[PDB]
Design an enzyme around this catalytic site. Structure first.
Site, PDB file in Angstrom:
ATOM      1  N   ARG A  79       0.845  -1.222   0.000  1.00 48.25           N
ATOM      2  CA  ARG A  79       0.000   0.000   0.000  1.00 48.25           C
ATOM      3  C   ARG A  79       0.879   1.271   0.000  1.00 48.25           C
ATOM      4  O   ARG A  79       0.878   2.027   0.963  1.00 48.25           O
ATOM      5  CB  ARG A  79      -0.906   0.023   1.257  1.00 48.25           C
ATOM      6  CG  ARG A  79      -1.873  -1.201   1.429  1.00 48.25           C
ATOM      7  CD  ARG A  79      -2.689  -1.092   2.724  1.00 48.25           C
ATOM      8  NE  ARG A  79      -1.771  -1.229   3.857  1.00 48.25           N
ATOM      9  CZ  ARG A  79      -1.196  -2.365   4.221  1.00 48.25           C
ATOM     10  NH1 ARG A  79      -1.531  -3.534   3.620  1.00 48.25           N
ATOM     11  NH2 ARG A  79      -0.257  -2.340   5.161  1.00 48.25           N
TER      12      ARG A  79
ATOM     13  N   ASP B 268       2.587  -8.229   6.975  1.00 47.58           N
ATOM     14  CA  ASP B 268       1.440  -7.536   6.371  1.00 47.58           C
ATOM     15  C   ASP B 268       0.248  -8.407   5.902  1.00 47.58           C
ATOM     16  O   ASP B 268      -0.399  -8.067   4.919  1.00 47.58           O
ATOM     17  CB  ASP B 268       1.905  -6.650   5.208  1.00 47.58           C
ATOM     18  CG  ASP B 268       0.922  -5.482   4.908  1.00 47.58           C
ATOM     19  OD1 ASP B 268       0.405  -4.830   5.844  1.00 47.58           O
ATOM     20  OD2 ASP B 268       0.758  -5.145   3.726  1.00 47.58           O
ATOM     21  N   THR B 269      -0.033  -9.521   6.575  1.00 49.91           N
ATOM     22  CA  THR B 269      -1.185 -10.342   6.167  1.00 49.91           C
ATOM     23  C   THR B 269      -2.159 -10.447   7.334  1.00 49.91           C
ATOM     24  O   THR B 269      -3.151  -9.714   7.388  1.00 49.91           O
ATOM     25  CB  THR B 269      -0.751 -11.744   5.634  1.00 49.91           C
ATOM     26  OG1 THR B 269       0.051 -12.413   6.613  1.00 49.91           O
ATOM     27  CG2 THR B 269       0.073 -11.598   4.336  1.00 49.91           C
TER      28      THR B 269
ATOM     29  N   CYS C 151      -1.262 -20.275  -0.416  1.00 47.19           N
ATOM     30  CA  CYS C 151      -0.546 -19.769   0.743  1.00 47.19           C
ATOM     31  C   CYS C 151       0.133 -20.836   1.607  1.00 47.19           C
ATOM     32  O   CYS C 151      -0.533 -21.738   2.099  1.00 47.19           O
ATOM     33  CB  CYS C 151      -1.498 -18.958   1.625  1.00 47.19           C
ATOM     34  SG  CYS C 151      -0.706 -18.248   3.070  1.00 47.19           S
ATOM     35  N   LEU C 152       1.435 -20.671   1.823  1.00 50.14           N
ATOM     36  CA  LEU C 152       2.250 -21.563   2.650  1.00 50.14           C
ATOM     37  C   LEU C 152       2.098 -21.219   4.113  1.00 50.14           C
ATOM     38  O   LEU C 152       2.351 -22.050   4.974  1.00 50.14           O
ATOM     39  CB  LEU C 152       3.727 -21.460   2.242  1.00 50.14           C
ATOM     40  CG  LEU C 152       4.055 -22.167   0.934  1.00 50.14           C
ATOM     41  CD1 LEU C 152       5.417 -21.715   0.469  1.00 50.14           C
ATOM     42  CD2 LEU C 152       4.011 -23.706   1.097  1.00 50.14           C
ATOM     43  N   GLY C 153       1.635 -20.002   4.397  1.00 57.79           N
ATOM     44  CA  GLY C 153       1.513 -19.534   5.777  1.00 57.79           C
ATOM     45  C   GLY C 153       0.117 -19.729   6.336  1.00 57.79           C
ATOM     46  O   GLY C 153      -0.174 -19.276   7.421  1.00 57.79           O
TER      47      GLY C 153
HETATM   48  C1  HEM Z   1      -4.556 -13.848   6.602  1.00 60.98           C
HETATM   49  C2  HEM Z   1      -3.297 -14.172   6.303  1.00 60.98           C
HETATM   50  C3  HEM Z   1      -2.801 -14.531   4.881  1.00 60.98           C
HETATM   51  C4  HEM Z   1      -3.401 -14.391   3.683  1.00 60.98           C
HETATM   52  C5  HEM Z   1      -4.842 -13.947   3.358  1.00 60.98           C
HETATM   53  C6  HEM Z   1      -2.488 -14.874   2.686  1.00 60.98           C
HETATM   54  C7  HEM Z   1      -2.758 -14.958   1.327  1.00 60.98           C
HETATM   55  C8  HEM Z   1      -1.899 -15.458   0.368  1.00 60.98           C
HETATM   56  C9  HEM Z   1      -2.157 -15.502  -1.045  1.00 60.98           C
HETATM   57  C10 HEM Z   1      -3.477 -15.019  -1.741  1.00 60.98           C
HETATM   58  C11 HEM Z   1      -1.105 -16.100  -1.629  1.00 60.98           C
HETATM   59  C12 HEM Z   1      -0.932 -16.385  -3.135  1.00 60.98           C
HETATM   60  C13 HEM Z   1      -0.363 -15.188  -3.924  1.00 60.98           C
HETATM   61  C14 HEM Z   1      -0.202 -15.531  -5.428  1.00 60.98           C
HETATM   62  O1  HEM Z   1      -0.752 -16.576  -5.956  1.00 60.98           O
HETATM   63  O2  HEM Z   1       0.420 -14.696  -6.155  1.00 60.98           O
HETATM   64  C15 HEM Z   1      -0.143 -16.445  -0.617  1.00 60.98           C
HETATM   65  C16 HEM Z   1       1.096 -17.011  -0.872  1.00 60.98           C
HETATM   66  C17 HEM Z   1       2.078 -17.140   0.066  1.00 60.98           C
HETATM   67  N1  HEM Z   1       1.956 -16.946   1.441  1.00 60.98           N
HETATM   68 FE1  HEM Z   1       0.261 -16.225   2.427  1.00 60.98          FE
HETATM   69  N2  HEM Z   1      -1.344 -15.316   3.344  1.00 60.98           N
HETATM   70  C18 HEM Z   1      -1.440 -15.008   4.666  1.00 60.98           C
HETATM   71  C19 HEM Z   1      -0.514 -15.330   5.641  1.00 60.98           C
HETATM   72  C20 HEM Z   1       0.799 -15.717   5.449  1.00 60.98           C
HETATM   73  C21 HEM Z   1       1.862 -15.786   6.451  1.00 60.98           C
HETATM   74  C22 HEM Z   1       1.691 -15.377   7.936  1.00 60.98           C
HETATM   75  C23 HEM Z   1       2.987 -16.155   5.796  1.00 60.98           C
HETATM   76  C24 HEM Z   1       4.431 -16.321   6.301  1.00 60.98           C
HETATM   77  C25 HEM Z   1       4.767 -16.098   7.580  1.00 60.98           C
HETATM   78  C26 HEM Z   1       2.644 -16.371   4.394  1.00 60.98           C
HETATM   79  C27 HEM Z   1       3.506 -16.855   3.413  1.00 60.98           C
HETATM   80  C28 HEM Z   1       3.209 -17.013   2.059  1.00 60.98           C
HETATM   81  C29 HEM Z   1       4.179 -17.471   1.087  1.00 60.98           C
HETATM   82  C30 HEM Z   1       5.653 -17.799   1.366  1.00 60.98           C
HETATM   83  C31 HEM Z   1       3.435 -17.566  -0.234  1.00 60.98           C
HETATM   84  C32 HEM Z   1       4.020 -17.893  -1.608  1.00 60.98           C
HETATM   85  C33 HEM Z   1       3.670 -19.322  -2.006  1.00 60.98           C
HETATM   86  C34 HEM Z   1       4.087 -19.476  -3.429  1.00 60.98           C
HETATM   87  O3  HEM Z   1       4.324 -18.457  -4.172  1.00 60.98           O
HETATM   88  O4  HEM Z   1       4.256 -20.655  -3.836  1.00 60.98           O
HETATM   89  N3  HEM Z   1       1.282 -16.191   4.242  1.00 60.98           N
HETATM   90  N4  HEM Z   1      -0.665 -16.085   0.618  1.00 60.98           N
HETATM   91  C1  LIG Z   2       0.224 -11.565  -2.165  1.00 57.90           C
HETATM   92  C2  LIG Z   2       0.905 -11.918  -0.847  1.00 57.90           C
HETATM   93  C3  LIG Z   2      -0.115 -11.771   0.298  1.00 57.90           C
HETATM   94  C4  LIG Z   2       1.567 -13.298  -0.940  1.00 57.90           C
HETATM   95  C5  LIG Z   2       2.423 -13.345   0.311  1.00 57.90           C
HETATM   96  C6  LIG Z   2       2.843 -11.893   0.624  1.00 57.90           C
HETATM   97  C7  LIG Z   2       2.202 -11.171  -0.563  1.00 57.90           C
HETATM   98  C8  LIG Z   2       2.096  -9.637  -0.450  1.00 57.90           C
HETATM   99  C9  LIG Z   2       2.991 -11.697  -1.701  1.00 57.90           C
HETATM  100  O1  LIG Z   2       3.930 -11.014  -2.443  1.00 57.90           O
HETATM  101  C10 LIG Z   2       2.673 -13.146  -1.989  1.00 57.90           C
END
Ligand code: HEM
Ligand SMILES: CC1(C)[C@@H]2CC[C@@]1(C)C(=O)C2
Ligand SMILES: [K+]
EC number: 1.14.15.1
Length: 405
Positions: free
Chosen positions: A177, A242-243, A348-350
């Site tokens: 943002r 930032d999630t 999402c891995l997280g």
């Molecule tokens: C409410 C919390 C969260 C939301 C809604 C969220 C949402 C997402 C989304 C929509 C993606 C896919 C983005 C794409 O396809 O371009 C993603 C990917 C990912 N997320 Fe999350 N996430 C959250 C929390 C977290 C947390 C806490 C972590 C790490 C501490 C994390 C790590 C990642 C990573 C490493 C990917 C990349 C996976 C890949 O590209 O193969 N996420 N997440």
């Molecule tokens: C779209 C996301 C929420 C997902 C994890 C962090 C984020 C900003 C990314 O660049 C991949």
């Protein structure tokens, strides 16, 4: 301002939505994005804002595009184009097949078994923060809980000093943002500037923190490079900072405004995991996208090689064609359809960490502060971007109604 409409894009599909400042923002950010689903609006529109790009507006197209990585590449996943071009985080900037070896490494640092390891410290932190607030009868929820709780958990997992948060949090925000003081490229460069020496250090003298694990890791059995480790660690920082931080504030704002919903979760706390999933649908908050690898006709629309397409993860579960009465929160909702955590190979891995943080928050907050509301007079403002959030959430309660545990 509006980029001149490209020759190939039909004039009748133009809908100038601004993902960083949507028209209807004052009604709530989810409400503002949901205007793309009003009866006048095609399944796939072109906005001239932010340099020009497609937007898929319905869960059917959003899902299909996320499944089709041969046409819709994640190499340039952010709008505007300069951000997408600079974006090189791993695994997200990579398509299968080469993406996958990197996901597997990332799973060693944020996967289910690590979250189970973190479980007691996640609970402890939730409780220490909430107990401290309980007697004061008020808080600034964004700064007093939503930020410190998930962020301190991430910094602990990463083995980073908490005093580095304001700087890293500022940088991660400029990528999702931007306030205009930094381009995405600048913010990225600064996050990497921070990481480089820590990565070098932890490759030399390996610890057990997430950076060490990633930095000393192997991908399909060959050593990760320092540059790969930096591109993966950057992404992890962004996810951590930032999630969940933003999502917690949407949920708590909703609970503050809706006593019947809190009453439901106080009267029956076994429903909290289902309530988590329904809030994850209603208050979905991420929107990134893909770039066309070739000219491609998609749902009767000619897409051109290099066109960017926003595929808002937020919109699928808000789609009335996925969920009847989508703007209504129904903890008993029978089939909670959404793409809040993404879709396809970049799921999402997280998400396991995220659900644990949310469910622990709901359980522990409602156990100590069952009755609260928005500070009277406070006009809650949302902010929109790659990840949407809440500017500030002043809450109040009567200490007499709280309970120490
Ligand atoms: C409410 C919390 C969260 C939301 C809604 C969220 C949402 C997402 C989304 C929509 C993606 C896919 C983005 C794409 O396809 O371009 C993603 C990917 C990912 N997320 Fe999350 N996430 C959250 C929390 C977290 C947390 C806490 C972590 C790490 C501490 C994390 C790590 C990642 C990573 C490493 C990917 C990349 C996976 C890949 O590209 O193969 N996420 N997440
Ligand atoms: C779209 C996301 C929420 C997902 C994890 C962090 C984020 C900003 C990314 O660049 C991949
Ligand atoms: K790129």
């Amino acid at each position: 301002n509006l980029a001149p409409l490209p020759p190939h894009v039909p004039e009748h599909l133009v809908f100038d939505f601004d993902m960083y400042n949507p028209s209807n923002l004052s009604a709530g950010v989810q409400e503002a994005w949901a205007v793309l689903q009003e009866s006048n609006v095609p399944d796939l529109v072109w906005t001239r804002c932010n340099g020009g790009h497609w937007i898929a507006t319905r869960g059917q197209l959003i899902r299909e595009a996320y499944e089709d990585y041969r046409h819709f590449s994640s190499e340039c996943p952010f709008i505007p184009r300069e951000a997408g071009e600079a974006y090189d985080f791993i695994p997200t900037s990579m398509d299968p097949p080469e993406q996958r070896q990197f996901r597997a490494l990332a799973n060693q640092v944020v996967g289910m078994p690590v979250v189970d390891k973190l479980e007691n410290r996640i609970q402890e932190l939730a409780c220490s923060l909430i107990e401290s607030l309980r007697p004061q009868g008020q808080c600034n929820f964004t700064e007093d809980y939503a930020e410190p709780f998930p962020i301190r958990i991430f910094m602990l997992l990463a083995g980073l000093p908490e005093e580095d948060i304001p700087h890293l949090k500022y940088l991660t925000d400029q990528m999702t943002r931007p306030d205009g003081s930094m381009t995405f490229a600048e913010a990225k460069e600064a996050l990497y500037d921070y990481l480089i020496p820590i990565i070098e250090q932890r490759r030399q003298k390996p610890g057990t923190d997430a950076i060490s694990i990633v930095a000393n890791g192997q991908v399909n059995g060959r050593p990760i490079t320092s540059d790969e480790a930096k591109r993966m660690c950057g992404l992890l920082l962004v996810g951590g900072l930032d999630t969940v931080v933003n999502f917690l504030s949407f949920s708590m704002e909703f609970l503050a405004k809706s006593p019947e919903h809190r009453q439901e979760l106080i009267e029956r706390p076994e429903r909290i995991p289902a309530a988590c999933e329904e809030l994850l649908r209603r208050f979905s908050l991420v929107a990134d996208g893909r770039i066309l690898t070739s000219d491609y006709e998609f749902h009767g629309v000619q897409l051109k090689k290099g066109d960017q397409i926003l595929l808002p993860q937020m919109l699928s579960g808000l789609d009335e064609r996925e969920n009847a009465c989508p703007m209504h929160v129904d903890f008993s909702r029978q089939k909670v359809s959404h793409t809040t955590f993404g879709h396809g190979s970049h799921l999402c891995l997280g998400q396991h960490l995220a659900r644990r943080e949310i469910i622990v928050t709901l359980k522990e907050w409602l156990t100590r502060i069952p009755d609260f509301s928005i500070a009277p007079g406070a006009q809650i403002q949302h902010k929109s971007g790659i990840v949407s959030g809440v500017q500030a959430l002043p809450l109040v309660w009567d200490p007499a109604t709280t309970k120490a545990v």
